[PDB]
Amino acid sequence: TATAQAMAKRHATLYGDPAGQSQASRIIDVKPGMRYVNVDSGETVAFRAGEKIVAWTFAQMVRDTSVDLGLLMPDLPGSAGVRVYIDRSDL
């Protein structure tokens, strides 16, 4: 389990890095049934569920990619099942 959490954190690294919420350019409220969000390569986004806030800087992706928000932030309530579509990098 601790090992499964380590595995998930390693996989999550493909998609970017944790960031300070002070660094975010927007805060998205994670709501039941929201389905998905769209983010840009390199964008820093804070995700909020009540008083819990977790932020993330998306990596420069080689192609359009998507990922479950629950992989990036398992501790954020309501994150599982919300799809994150990350736009390919301009670079």
Add this chain to the structure above:
Amino acid sequence: STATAQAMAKRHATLYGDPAGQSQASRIIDVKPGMRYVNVDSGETVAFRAGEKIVAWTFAQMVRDTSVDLGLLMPDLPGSAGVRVYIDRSDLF
């Protein structure tokens, strides 16, 4: 005054896509006080909600990344003005 403006706003909005029905939208975006932007794809059909009012839009196929104010796309959705929609470039070019 008030009126002519309405008409030129609809004209501006037309460059960015077409009114859509909620039944064709792939997601519903909550429009809340303080919201500043959202990201949509060229060709995406998105519904925007204020309380229980829902207005949907199908974004045009854009030659480059561009933005438009939601308040110009849907003046009758309360709180839409000031929310900027970032539209990703179309893959069709």
